Structures are given as C-alpha cells and as structure tokens.
Amino acid sequence: TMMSGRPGRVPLQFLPNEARSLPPPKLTDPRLVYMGFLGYCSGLIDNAIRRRPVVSAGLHRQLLYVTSFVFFGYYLLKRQDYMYALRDHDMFAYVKSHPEDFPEKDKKTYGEILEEFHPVR
Amino acid sequence: KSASSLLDLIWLETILPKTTSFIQMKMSIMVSNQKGLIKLYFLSFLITIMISMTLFN
Amino acid sequence: WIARTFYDGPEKNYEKTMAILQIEAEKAELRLKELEVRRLMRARGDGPWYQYPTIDKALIDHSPKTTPDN
Amino acid sequence: PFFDVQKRLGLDLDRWMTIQSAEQPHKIPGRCHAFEKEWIECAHGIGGIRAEK
Amino acid sequence: AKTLLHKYSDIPEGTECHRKAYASTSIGGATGLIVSAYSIALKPPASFLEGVARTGRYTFTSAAIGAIFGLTSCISAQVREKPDDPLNYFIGGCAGGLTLGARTRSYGIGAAACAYMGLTAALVKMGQLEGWQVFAEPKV
Amino acid sequence: NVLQIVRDHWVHILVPVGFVFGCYLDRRSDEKLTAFRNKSLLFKRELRPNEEVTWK
Amino acid sequence: PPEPTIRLQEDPDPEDENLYEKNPDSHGYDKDPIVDLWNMRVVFFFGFSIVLVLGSTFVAYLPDYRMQEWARREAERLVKYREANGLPLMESNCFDPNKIQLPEDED
Amino acid sequence: MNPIIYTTLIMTVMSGTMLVMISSHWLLIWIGFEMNLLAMIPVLMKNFNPRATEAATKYFLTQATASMMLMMAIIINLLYSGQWTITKMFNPVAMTMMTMALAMKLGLSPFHFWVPEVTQGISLQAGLLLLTWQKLAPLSVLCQISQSINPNLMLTMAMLSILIGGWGGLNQTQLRKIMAYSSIAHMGWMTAVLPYNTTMTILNLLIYITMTLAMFMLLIHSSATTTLSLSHTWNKMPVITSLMMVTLLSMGGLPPLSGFMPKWMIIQEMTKNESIIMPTLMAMTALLNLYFYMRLAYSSSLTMFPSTNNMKMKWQFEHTKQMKLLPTMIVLSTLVLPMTPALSSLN
Amino acid sequence: MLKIIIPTTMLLPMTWMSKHNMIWINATVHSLLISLISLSLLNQLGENSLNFSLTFFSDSLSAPLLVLTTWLLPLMLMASQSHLSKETTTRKKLYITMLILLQLFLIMTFTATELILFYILFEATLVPTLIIITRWGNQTERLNAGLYFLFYTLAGSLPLLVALVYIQNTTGSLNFLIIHYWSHPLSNSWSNIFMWLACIMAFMVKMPLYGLHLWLPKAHVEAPIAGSMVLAAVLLKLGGYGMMRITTILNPLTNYMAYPFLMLSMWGMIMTSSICLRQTDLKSLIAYSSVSHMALVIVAIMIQTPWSFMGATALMIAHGLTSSMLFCLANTNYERVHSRTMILARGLQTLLPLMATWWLVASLTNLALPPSINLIGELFIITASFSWSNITIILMGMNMMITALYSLYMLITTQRGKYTHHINNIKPSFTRENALMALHILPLLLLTLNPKMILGPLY
Amino acid sequence: PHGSPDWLKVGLTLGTSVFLWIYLIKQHKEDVLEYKRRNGLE
Numbered sequence A: 001t002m003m004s005g006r007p008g009r010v011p012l013q014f015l016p017n018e019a020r021s022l023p024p025p026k027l028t029d030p031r032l033v034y035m036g037f038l039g040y041c042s043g044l045i046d047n048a049i050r051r052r053p054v055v056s057a058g059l060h061r062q063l064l065y066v067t068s069f070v071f072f073g074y075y076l077l078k079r080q081d082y083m084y085a086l087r088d089h090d091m092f093a094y095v096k097s098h099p100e101d102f103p104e105k106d107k108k109t110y111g112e113i114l115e116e117f118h119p120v121r
Numbered sequence B: 001k002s003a004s005s006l007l008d009l010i011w012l013e014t015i016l017p018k019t020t021s022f023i024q025m026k027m028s029i030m031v032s033n034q035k036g037l038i039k040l041y042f043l044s045f046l047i048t049i050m051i052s053m054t055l056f057n
Numbered sequence C: 001w002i003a004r005t006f007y008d009g010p011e012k013n014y015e016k017t018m019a020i021l022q023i024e025a026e027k028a029e030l031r032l033k034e035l036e037v038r039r040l041m042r043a044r045g046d047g048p049w050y051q052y053p054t055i056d057k058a059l060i061d062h063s064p065k066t067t068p069d070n
Numbered sequence D: 001p002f003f004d005v006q007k008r009l010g011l012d013l014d015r016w017m018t019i020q021s022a023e024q025p026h027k028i029p030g031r032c033h034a035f036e037k038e039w040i041e042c043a044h045g046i047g048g049i050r051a052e053k
Numbered sequence E: 001a002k003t004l005l006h007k008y009s010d011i012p013e014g015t016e017c018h019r020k021a022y023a024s025t026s027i028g029g030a031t032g033l034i035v036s037a038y039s040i041a042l043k044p045p046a047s048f049l050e051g052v053a054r055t056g057r058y059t060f061t062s063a064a065i066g067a068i069f070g071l072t073s074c075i076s077a078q079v080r081e082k083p084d085d086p087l088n089y090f091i092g093g094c095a096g097g098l099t100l101g102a103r104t105r106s107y108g109i110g111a112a113a114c115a116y117m118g119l120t121a122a123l124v125k126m127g128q129l130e131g132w133q134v135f136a137e138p139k140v
Numbered sequence F: 001n002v003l004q005i006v007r008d009h010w011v012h013i014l015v016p017v018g019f020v021f022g023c024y025l026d027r028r029s030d031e032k033l034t035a036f037r038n039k040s041l042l043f044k045r046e047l048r049p050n051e052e053v054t055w056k
Numbered sequence G: 001p002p003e004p005t006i007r008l009q010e011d012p013d014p015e016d017e018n019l020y021e022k023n024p025d026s027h028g029y030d031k032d033p034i035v036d037l038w039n040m041r042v043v044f045f046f047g048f049s050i051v052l053v054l055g056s057t058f059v060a061y062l063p064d065y066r067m068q069e070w071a072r073r074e075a076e077r078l079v080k081y082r083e084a085n086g087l088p089l090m091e092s093n094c095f096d097p098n099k100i101q102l103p104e105d106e107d
Numbered sequence H: 001m002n003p004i005i006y007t008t009l010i011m012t013v014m015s016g017t018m019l020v021m022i023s024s025h026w027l028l029i030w031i032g033f034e035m036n037l038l039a040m041i042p043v044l045m046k047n048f049n050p051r052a053t054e055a056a057t058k059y060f061l062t063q064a065t066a067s068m069m070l071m072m073a074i075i076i077n078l079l080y081s082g083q084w085t086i087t088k089m090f091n092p093v094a095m096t097m098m099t100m101a102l103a104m105k106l107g108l109s110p111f112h113f114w115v116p117e118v119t120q121g122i123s124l125q126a127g128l129l130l131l132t133w134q135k136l137a138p139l140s141v142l143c144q145i146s147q148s149i150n151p152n153l154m155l156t157m158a159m160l161s162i163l164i165g166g167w168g169g170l171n172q173t174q175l176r177k178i179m180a181y182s183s184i185a186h187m188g189w190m191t192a193v194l195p196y197n198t199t200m201t202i203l204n205l206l207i208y209i210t211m212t213l214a215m216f217m218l219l220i221h222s223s224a225t226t227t228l229s230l231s232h233t234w235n236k237m238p239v240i241t242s243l244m245m246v247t248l249l250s251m252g253g254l255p256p257l258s259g260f261m262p263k264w265m266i267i268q269e270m271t272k273n274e275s276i277i278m279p280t281l282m283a284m285t286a287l288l289n290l291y292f293y294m295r296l297a298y299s300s301s302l303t304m305f306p307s308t309n310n311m312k313m314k315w316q317f318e319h320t321k322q323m324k325l326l327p328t329m330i331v332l333s334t335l336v337l338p339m340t341p342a343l344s345s346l347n
Numbered sequence I: 001m002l003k004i005i006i007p008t009t010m011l012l013p014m015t016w017m018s019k020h021n022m023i024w025i026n027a028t029v030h031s032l033l034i035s036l037i038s039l040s041l042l043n044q045l046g047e048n049s050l051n052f053s054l055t056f057f058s059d060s061l062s063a064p065l066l067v068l069t070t071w072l073l074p075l076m077l078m079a080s081q082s083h084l085s086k087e088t089t090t091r092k093k094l095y096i097t098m099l100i101l102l103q104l105f106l107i108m109t110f111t112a113t114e115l116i117l118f119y120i121l122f123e124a125t126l127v128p129t130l131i132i133i134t135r136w137g138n139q140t141e142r143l144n145a146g147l148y149f150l151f152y153t154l155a156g157s158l159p160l161l162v163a164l165v166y167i168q169n170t171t172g173s174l175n176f177l178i179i180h181y182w183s184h185p186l187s188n189s190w191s192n193i194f195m196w197l198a199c200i201m202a203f204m205v206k207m208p209l210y211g212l213h214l215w216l217p218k219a220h221v222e223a224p225i226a227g228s229m230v231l232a233a234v235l236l237k238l239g240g241y242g243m244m245r246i247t248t249i250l251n252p253l254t255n256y257m258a259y260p261f262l263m264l265s266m267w268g269m270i271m272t273s274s275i276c277l278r279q280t281d282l283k284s285l286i287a288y289s290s291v292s293h294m295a296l297v298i299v300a301i302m303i304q305t306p307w308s309f310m311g312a313t314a315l316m317i318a319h320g321l322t323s324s325m326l327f328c329l330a331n332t333n334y335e336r337v338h339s340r341t342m343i344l345a346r347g348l349q350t351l352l353p354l355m356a357t358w359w360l361v362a363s364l365t366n367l368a369l370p371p372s373i374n375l376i377g378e379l380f381i382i383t384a385s386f387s388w389s390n391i392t393i394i395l396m397g398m399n400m401m402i403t404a405l406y407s408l409y410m411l412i413t414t415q416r417g418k419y420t421h422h423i424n425n426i427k428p429s430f431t432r433e434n435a436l437m438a439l440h441i442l443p444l445l446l447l448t449l450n451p452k453m454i455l456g457p458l459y
Numbered sequence J: 001p002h003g004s005p006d007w008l009k010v011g012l013t014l015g016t017s018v019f020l021w022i023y024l025i026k027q028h029k030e031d032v033l034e035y036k037r038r039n040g041l042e
C-alpha cells in the first residue's frame, strides 16, 4: 500500500479537507491519555536529570509537557484515522470495481463437507 | 560421573553455549582486526564493485 | 447471594462472546481481502495504490521550433 | 523523502530542465523532440507500472 | 554468475555423477578464489609468492570440498533409488565436512564441519523441494 | 488527628480507588459489546412489561 | 617491593546484625519495634484472617456455573424418558445421519 | 570557531539535505549532496587535533568518491534515456552504480569501513550529527527509486551490514566505535525493507534517530568515551546510568521497549512477501548487538565499579549546560510501543 | 479484567510515595488485597470462557495461574524484607517496582486474547527478571547467569515471532477464539515441520527441556530469593501455558513431531532426578527437581489427552507452590550460615524444631504424598501416559523412586544427625519466616480439598 | 545559585499551556460540528 502517488493528493497537507468528514477522536481517548502520560514521564525525567525534587519541582513545566504531548497526540491521531479510512475506502472501491477477482464463494454446510479425521492415540 | 559431570557440566555446555561463544569470538576477532590502512579497504571495495558488476546482472 | 451480588447471568457472557467473535471474524476477512487487493494493485497498477510518477505533459512546449520537423 | 514543495507552491525551481521538449531558448528543438513528446503524452497520469507495460 | 548454478541444476540428481562433480568443483573453485581475493585485499601476508600460495591452497581446498560433496550426494541418491530426499544431501554434506577436517587435520573441526554441512545441504535440498525463496521478489 | 495523619496515610486510598476505577472501566467496555444482546438463538426472550435491556 | 599490599581503599566487611540483641520480641520484620509489631499484625490479619479464611469460604460456596447439578438433572430426566419408551439409551451417532450428505464414491 | 560561522555551517548542511529532499532534478540532488559535504567538514574539525583532521580527510575521500559514482550513474541514465527527473532508473548497472554510491554514502557494507574510523576520530557532538542527520538524504533518494533496486543486491548488502555490525561491536571498548557498529547494523535493518515498504524504512529511521540522539546526549552529559570512563558515572550520576541502561535495552530490540517496534514491523512486512529465512537470520544476528549492549549495561549500571579519590570534588559541582530535549528523547526512545499503529501517518 | 490490572498499576505510585519505613507494610497489605480481588476469577463455566473484552479473557487454565501470580507477590516481599535491610530507600523502592512490573506483565500475559500480545508480554517478563538477577545477586557469577537466562530464551523466542506473523498472513487472525474455531489440519510437509518447531521450541526452552535446561541452575542459584521464587513458581509455567494454548493449530503433526521431545523429557526426568542425588548445593538440587517436574509436565502436554491436560495443570500449580517453599527454606538457612552448602549446617532439627517441621512438610509434598495435588497431577499424567504406551510406567516408577530418595536425602542431610560444633550464630526462627512457610503450605492443603479448581478447562 | 522564581518564565509557561488547551477545545468543538454537518447527523 504505497499511497504517496495516490491521485489528487496535495503534497504538504498534514490533514486534507475530506478528513473533516470523519469523527474526531474523543478528548478522553485512551491514546490521548497515553500521550499525556508520556508527557508526564518526560517531566519527571527532566526533574530527575537536573537534580530537582522529581515530583514537585516545576508544576508549570510539567503542565506544559503534558499539554504539548496531548496537542500533538490529538493531531497525530486525526491523521492516523484519516489514513486508515483512506486505505479502507480504496480497498472497498477496488473490490467493487473488480468483480472477477473476488468471486462469491458458494456457501457449503459442514454436513456435506468431508474433513479427514485424525485420532489422538 | 555421567549425568552430572560428563553430560550436564561438559557436553551440553560444549554444544550450545560454548560453541556459540567460540564462533562469535573468532568472527569478531576476524572482522574487527583492521589496521586502519585505507589501501586495504579501497582494494576490498574495488573487489566488491567488480564482483557485484559481474554477479548481479 | 454470591451469584446475586458479584456475578451476572450466562446470557451476558454468551452474547458478548458472539459480538467479539463477529468482530474478530470480520477483521480476519478484511485482512485477507486487503492482502489480496495489495497484491493485485502492485501487480497490475490500475489501482490508486502503487502509482509511481510519470513526466507531466504540461511541461511540453507546443510551438514552432525553428525547424518544420520539430 | 521527496517533499514536493514546488507543486505545493507552484514555484518551478528545477522542472524546466528535466526534459528536452520543455521551452528551450529561442525555440531550439531537441534531436528527439517528437519521440519524447509522444512518449510523455502516452504515459501522462497512467502511472509507472502501466506506462512501462 | 548464475551460469554455474544453471549448469549444476540442469543435470538430474541421480544421473551423470561426473558432470555434477565437475560443476560442484567449479563452484568451489570460484568461491575459494573469491575468499582468497578478499583475504589478500584485507591482509597482505608477506609477499607475492606467499599470497599466490595461499590463493592456491584456499582454491584447491574449496574445490576438493565441492567435489567430495557432489560425488557423495549424487552416488547416495543413485544407489538409494530415492531421489529428491534430503538425507542423501546430508550424507554428501557430511562427507564434504569430513574431507575439510582431514585437510585441516583436526578431528573436532572435521566432526564439526560434518554436522553443519550435513544440515546446510539438507536445508538447501528442502528449500529446492518446497520452493523457499532466500531473495523474495516484492509481492504485495 | 485529622489533616496530619492524612499527609502520611493518603497513599492507602490509591489501590481501592484503582479497583473502583477498574470496575467502572470494565462496565464501560461492557457497554460497547451489546450488538447481540437479546439476539442469541439460545436466549431470544420477549422483554418484560418494565424491562428495556436483558442485561446492562 | 614497597607496595602496600592493598589493592584499593575498601571498607571492611561488616558483621551481620542480630535483631534479637537490640530488641527481644523482634518478629524479624524491622529494627524499629513499632514498625516491626505493626508489620507482623498487618501480615497476619490480611494473610490468615482475610484472604486464607474469607477467600476459602468464598471459593467453597461458589455458585454452580460449571452446571454439574444441571447436567445431572438433565441426564436423570433423559434416562427416565428413554427407559420409559424403550429407546436404546445413548445413540452411537452424535448427529442424525439424515442431515449428513455423504459423498458418493461410485468406484 | 565563531558561533556565527558554526550556525552558518549547520544551516548549510541542513539546506543541502533539504535541497536533496525537495528537488526533482538529478543535478540538483547532486548539488545538495555537494553542499552537505562541503559544509560538513569544519563541523567534524571543530576541535583541532590530528585525529579529527584524519577523520575529516577520510570522510571527505569516501564522500567525494561516492558523489563521483553518483554523477556517473546519473550520466549513464541520461545516456540511455534523455531524462533528468528522479524516477525509475530506466537502465541496468547504471542503477547498480547508483545503489553502490548511495550505500557508500550511508555506510552500508562492504563500504562500512570509514564509519568506525570517522566516528572514533571526531568528538561526541560531531559523531551525533554524523550518525543522525547524515542519513536523511541518501535514504530519501533510495526511497524515491525504491521501485528500481535489484532486490538481490540490496538484500545482500543489508544482510552483510547487519552481520558486520553485530560481529564488529563485540570487540569494541571505545563507545564511539560501538555507536558506529550499531549504526551499521541499524542501516542494514533499514535497507532490507526498502524493496517492500518504504514506510517501514522511515519508521525504522525515526526510531533509530531518536534512540541514537538519546544515547549520544547521555554520553555527552556524562563525558565518557570509554567503557572504564563510563564505569565511573554511577558514583556521580546514578540516574544517568539507569536511564542509559534502559536506553541500551531499548536499542537491543527487547520488548516492550521502543526498539522492538521497527524490527517487529519489518519482519511482519517481510513475511507478507513470502520471505521467511532472511528475517530469521536478521533476528539471530541482532542477538549479537544485544549481547554487546548487555555487556555495556553490565559495566555501566548493573554493577558498581571502583572509583577514584578525586571524584569527591566532582560531587560539589553541577552541569552548567543542560540539554532540554534529553528527557523527551529518552521517553520517546523507551515508551512509545503502544502507539505503534500511528505509523499509518506515513511518517 | 481491569479490576485487577489497575490496582497493580496503582501499586507503583503508592510504593514511590510511601514513607521511608512503611514501604513493606503498604506493599504487603495492598498485594494481599489484590490477591483477594483476583480470587473472584475462579468462578468459571463449563462453556467457552470468561471473555471480558476484545483484549483480555479468562479461563480455568488462566485463573489458577493468575491467582498464584497475585498470591506470590506478598510472599516475595516478605522474604526480601530480610536481606534488603541495609539498602537505601530508593533502591528498595526500585526492587519493589521490579516486582510489581513483573506481576503486571504476568497478569497481562495470562489473559492475552491475542498471540502477538501474548508474545510481547511473554518477552516483557524478561527485563525485570534480568535486572533482579544481575543487580541484587550476591556472587560474581550472577552476570554470567543473566546472560544465559536471556539468550537461551531469545534463541527460542525470536523464531516464534516469525512463525506467529506468518500465521497471521495465512489464517488472517491470531485471536485465540478464531484460531480454535477455524483450526485446520497441518499437512505433513517440511515447511509445516519447521513451523511446528518454531511454534514449539520457544515454550520448550522455558519449561525447560532436558537438553536446554542449562540456564535454569545458574539463574536459580545466582538470583536473590524473590527472583528464585518467581522463576520456579510462575516463569516456568509460561512455557506450559504457551504450549497448551498453541498445540491446537499443530495437529495432526504433533503425533510424529512429539517423539524426540517425549524421549528427551522421559529420559531427562530420570537424569535430573539422579543428578539431585549427588549435589553439594541446596539451590542447585531444588532447581534440578524443578527441571524433573517440568519434564513430566512436558510429557503430559505432548501426549495431548484430557487427563494429561488436567494433570499438567494441577502439577504446574503444585510445583510452583512447593518449589517456592523449598527455596524459602534454603534461604532461611543461608541467611544464618552464609555458605549455601548442604553438608556444612547439620542437625538443625535439634536447634530449630518448627523449621524442621516446615522442612518435613515441604519434602513430603515435593515427594508427591497423596492426597496432595502434587500426587493428583503426577497420577493423572502417569495414567494418561500409560494409556499412551504401557512401557512408560517403568520410567515413571523410576522417577518416583528417585524423587523420594533425593527429597528425603535433602531433609535428612540438613535436619538430622549431629549439629556442627563451630556454628554458633544460629538464632531462633523469626515470626516472619514461620509465617512465610505457613502461607506457602496452607494453600496446598486447602486446594487438596477442592481439586477441580486447578484441573483446567478439560475438567 | 541565589535566584527568585522567574515570574516572566512562569507566566509564559502558564499562558502557553492555557492557550494550547483553549485552542484544542475550540478545534475539537469545530471538528465535531463539521463532522455532524457533513454526515447530516444534526
């Protein structure tokens, strides 16, 4: 799936306009919470490296870390969801446009299919 | 004599871990022992270029 | 008392398992279909995927060129 | 990798020198202007795989 | 190039023992010469004569290993009357390992070579039978 | 003494709060797997006069 | 040989400290007697009293989700039915043959 | 040097890389490579000593030879098709020479010999820049023409790079040579997935860049270039040694750390194209990288080595210059495995 | 499933925010409460499973292992309380953090609805164990031990990953439920043979198999007491769980492929039981006993019969508890004597009678005295193997005899005879150690009352 | 050394965090509204 050459793709657009037709991630998304947790860990490590009280050295600095991580994580999640939606849309369109390559398998019940039986002895 | 020393302490140790250590140590000594002479490295590069031109086409 | 205060009935787990099985089955079929679609698109190239660039024809100059035969 | 800044901005930094049949000075034609023009027109928007085939 | 591979693969496994031995000897000589060239480029031992002596030793060792492996593998496949069996390649590989050990004059190395070569030859035969691709072409 | 032992024993509320939050999260995950509720061939059941969902 | 015969400046290896000399009734938990006693008490109360007894009682009185009594009663009613009508107890075929479509060999 | 001059040189290096990345003409790509090479040398020779000058001249020789080979490949491609655009290579071994030139620029085997030498000669900051930023342009060029490579040659060179890095890292006591061999192995991992998925190549490059940045900046913070010099860090900054060991475990590919994400993904991608033997061999070879990482971790944090009496004075002083991005780099190189599907962002 | 996972995660901030002298109390109390919470998972059904969500599911194979994993942490803390007394508060907190991370990884591993998640956590358990072994070990061999314990594992587990992703490319899924419901026979092919080997050897290296068991004595002898307990009690059972979960897709190729491993295990139980007879080290003896028991469990899993699976589940649980107790007893001896050699400290029953009683009970339960669950698992495996082939009974009888011999040898050498004259630093046993042994042994004799709780999903 | 809490830096950090949070909330509201409008929900 190389979608760099996908037709009608603006080069340096992070989020295209059609991406606005997709539901945005909730602000309580677990991935957003993980990004905020990553920011908090970055703040704790920053306090530790500089030899400061790890938990209660800079509250403004840790808040900025968490906020920036949440911001970037929200936008990254939007882009990821859009990209996966594009992949699914292309796959479904290709399947619809090539009926001869994806035939409907005949439904066959297990009562009429002969499977070899291997005893456990 | 057999279960503890001969097999467990010697041969089962000789096969998997000791042979691996010996082979890796020998290969590391062979690869890393370069005298830092760009003449040898350049000759090797020329040999590799000729080999790839004569092999991958 | 234990069943009343701590656990629920079997229908809850039964139907949750049915929903989970449905989701996982659909995911597996989608994975196989995506693999087949990727193979076809890379082999043939008529799909939106694997579209390598080609020289734009808007760069060509269509004018007399000081010689009648171009 | 490739960041198509030129297409986004419409700058034409280096595209004028890519092909023989693109606005030479004094309208001087290349030796294979017709062949390159035909080959480029054949493969426009088709894509590398289908163009090669 | 792939000419030697084609020459070796075209001959049927259970027939033309001498031709298979010749192809294996040629492949062994080629790889031995390549290894000798790499060693000379990386390490000039003492002089031209010592370098050519080392080249000859390596090339004849590799050619002998290839020869022994081919004859044993082909003879075993012919006598056992069961072609396309990795066991013959194992035995051929084992024989090749033994001759390398005899050349270097060490029971351990000879023993070690026999076990490893036998495994590699069996794996190669298995991959030929099952179509395993070392260098897979881009599929999807 | 209140407001003094709290600053020393406030860590003891962490695990029970985690347990309660985990129970809530388990119920929240339960809420998203209701596609087959009251649709199993084994438990197709007509709803009671004052029942909306067979299970929550 | 003017070497001091000392490889480095090393602290001497300390002797093991016995918790019974500085505190009889030591419980082997801590050097601080109060922390020691309360560690013993919490370990005993939450290990033996809470988990080992209440958890054992909870496991003992677990409701029958394995359906052992249910399976027993089902079997009793089924065998009562089959003895009454004379059907030959359990059949050899788990699934009825009329709903199975065998492949004809014609060999 | 003058801070203005250093800033100008760094911006010129970045501008050369950007010119390589944004251009569609082969001549402009060559020009960007030339600009990057021109501005790179004084950065390698910031601290003036014979070792730095030797490393700089070796680097210049290798890069100039690679640039000439690249121009030769461009000229042959132009000869067999009057095309300057960066697209399918349109020809045989002209493509082979392009691949060889880009491999020499990247340091792939068998053109790997200059990497340990140049990394050892130059300082830690120059090594950081060399091993991090100098990979973007050749990898971008390779990704653009990834539909043209001969898979046999690229896969052979990638496997050779992995093997050589793994074997060469085992014999090293100097930290910079360890970093160089790690870079060689990671480049080998990167280029073995180029024929199948360039997105995996870019993901691996991002992860490796983050990990290498964290590693080099930790080494700069605790100013040690040798194993025994690094063994003294526990007696002043134990937290630095602990973070260093966690980063080393991440670089070894151990789950659930971040360094597991690329290889995993690559292996998965490689099994989608019926390639089974080579991913297995790659993992067995990466075990060697893990071994020498583990030896460094043993010497660094998991054991307490003897110290010196003078270290007491160092207890009374604090680092005046601090790296702001070090905590973020450590966290990113350690704890972003759960965010793996975000690789759909075509990073 | 989160009602167990979240409190385990909260164990970390509580540990790091605790007072300098209240870390052990808080950790022990809250770990015991978490174990009480985890006891609720034992209510399983004869139907499919307890599928909590798309990510985590429970089973009557998973539930006993989860309960044992949760119950082991307080005992590990109680045993580590002794030798970490002279440690700084930060390093004690780091040790507790390693233990908590190990417990969380094991909890998430045992549920693991998907195979790649199972692999990720199954390897994630490696890092805390390696750090614990190589940082808080006493001797100079610990580093070497760690290397072994690492590389062996990876040597088996990196191929497995490959196989796993390969399967997901063909089947289309790695979910356990879909894998079981859509299972298809494996054709007898070389490719399928190597897929079988890749799927199997990763778990067979962790049991460990007789040929691949060299890392275990090193890791057990060199690790601290908590590391030894977690290695012998739970970490050995990960391979058994993995084989039990993954043998479904390997049929019918298991019939042919199982012969080398069956031979290796059936002869290696005898070999290791004989090795235990001539041992100058207590920890090495206990480690080799663990190897023998897991060889029997390997035989049970390979035979692949319902009685085999029930017996294997019971034996894993019983061996975990018993081996942890034995390691604790040996550690209590070592903390007084500082030598870890069986022959030096003798006649200890005269000096420490209650500890001698604990030794006797532990040896009796290791010797598989009925009606202990050790004997239940042993007997079920023996019956299934006899049905497999009547000649196995000779090897199993030999193993039973040698097991009794070396168990009573270890008991008699240390507890009976005449005390060493010059050893005078043997203080009376503390309340902590006696409580540790009681908390080890009481669950075994309670579980013998309700065996069906540990007999697995085939009960 | 001997330094007071730099109120300029503290104010800048607090303002940056508050501005980022406000912008994120506004952007989320706009995206939700835009998605509803495009898909014809409300």
Ligand SMILES: CCCCCCCCCCCCCCCCCC(=O)OC[C@H](COP(=O)([O-])OCC(O)COP(=O)([O-])OC[C@@H](COC(=O)CCCCCCCCCCCCCCCCC)OC(=O)CCCCCCCCCCCCCCCCC)OC(=O)CCCCCCCCCCCCCCCCC
Residues within 6 Å of the ligand: A040, A041, A042, A044, A045, A048, A052, A053, A054, A055, F014, F017, H238, H239, H242, H243, H245, H246, H301, H302, H334, H335, I009, I012, I013, I016, I017, I090, I091, I094, I097, I101, I104, I127, I128, I131, I135
């Ligand atoms: C699985 C997912 C779930 C778990 C996630 C795991 C990761 C999470 C955390 C990630 C890292 C972030 C923080 C680490 C920064 C390091 C700072 C530090 O050292 O700690 C000192 C600090 C206390 O010491 P201090 O008095 O401030 O000053 C002493 C100096 O800092 C230092 O004193 P010193 O220098 O004198 O002591 C020297 C010592 C100091 O050296 C260190 O301690 C280094 C710190 C560890 C390395 C961090 C690596 C980066 C993260 C990787 C995590 C790997 C996880 C994967 C599993 C593999 C494990 C390797 O180093 C040594 O002793 C040398 C030998 C060390 C042995 C071998 C090293 C192994 C380290 C591997 C640890 C990995 C897990 C770390 C967990 C957190 C540890 C703090 O600890 C803390 O207080 C912070 C802990 C977290 C704060 C919790 C606050 C939340 C509670 C309130 C809100 C409630 C939440 C729930 C809301 C709802 C309730 C109502």
Ligand SMILES: CCCCCCCCCCCCCCCCC[C@@H](O)O[C@H](CO[C@H](O)CCCCCCCCCCCCCCC)COP(=O)(O)OCC[N+](C)(C)C
Residues within 6 Å of the ligand: G051, G052, G055, G056, G057, G059, G060, G061, G062, I039, I064, I067, I068, I071, I317, I443, I446, I447, I449, I450
């Ligand atoms: C000191 C000397 C002795 C003094 C004391 C004298 C008194 C002796 C009596 C004690 C033992 C004698 C035997 C008497 C047996 C009576 C109790 C028995 O009948 O109850 C068992 C019940 O016991 C439990 O089933 C077993 C205990 C639970 C085990 C869980 C362990 C606790 C958790 C702690 C952590 C676990 C760590 C290990 C991980 C797995 C069997 O119950 P069951 O026949 O079925 O049905 C119960 C009733 N129903 C029908 C309503 C359901």
Ligand SMILES: CCCCCCCCCCCCCCCCC[C@@H](O)O[C@H](CO[C@H](O)CCCCCCCCCCCCCCC)COP(=O)(O)OCC[N+](C)(C)C
Residues within 6 Å of the ligand: A004, A010, A011, A012, A013, A014, A076, D001, D002, D003, D004, H202, H203, H206, H207, H210, H332, H336, H339, H340, H341, H342, H343, H345, H346, H347
């Ligand atoms: C290693 C951990 C990840 C860290 C990543 C860096 C974090 C700081 C970056 C700060 C913001 C950078 C975003 C750039 C803003 C606009 C970008 C936009 O203009 O570019 C688009 C592209 O967007 C960017 O490429 C995506 C960047 C997102 C990178 C994050 C992915 C990380 C992988 C999963 C690990 C989880 C990390 C989570 C913690 C950070 C258009 O690209 P296009 O011209 O059309 O094609 C070129 C690329 N091709 C050739 C591959 C197709």
Ligand SMILES: CCCCCCCCCCCCCCCCC[C@@H](O)O[C@H](CO[C@H](O)CCCCCCCCCCCCCCC)COP(=O)(O)OCC[N+](C)(C)C
Residues within 6 Å of the ligand: E085, E086, E087, E090, E119, E122, I188, I189, I190, I193, I210, I211, I212, I260, I261
């Ligand atoms: C170190 C401590 C123990 C470690 C683990 C040991 C366990 C792994 C051992 C693997 C089990 C055997 C591997 C293959 C078994 C297949 C059955 C075969 O052996 O029997 C004959 C096979 O004949 C020969 O054995 C052919 C193979 C000969 C080459 C293999 C090397 C023999 C010894 C090597 C052992 C070294 C193992 C360790 C490697 C590092 C049957 O003849 P055939 O009907 O035709 O083949 C049937 C299979 N088909 C249908 C797929 C074709």
Ligand SMILES: CCCCCCCC/C=C\CCCCCCCC(=O)O[C@H](COC(=O)CCCCCCC/C=C/CCCCCCCC)COP(=O)(O)OCCN
Residues within 6 Å of the ligand: E119, E123, E130, E131, E132, E133, H274, H275, H276, H277, H280, I152, I155, I156, I159, I162, I163, I166, I190, I191, I192, I194, I195, I196, I197, I198, I201, I205, I212
């Ligand atoms: C404790 C240390 C032991 C180390 C573990 C060793 C056992 C694992 C087996 C070796 C690695 C094999 C990994 C296979 C991954 C599964 C994928 C698979 O099975 O697919 C097969 C792939 O099969 C292979 O490619 C196998 C080639 C093996 C190459 C590497 C060999 C490594 C050494 C093997 C010798 C040792 C054998 C016994 C080891 C037992 C452990 C001592 C089919 O390939 P396709 O081409 O896609 O199918 C289409 C055509 N039918």
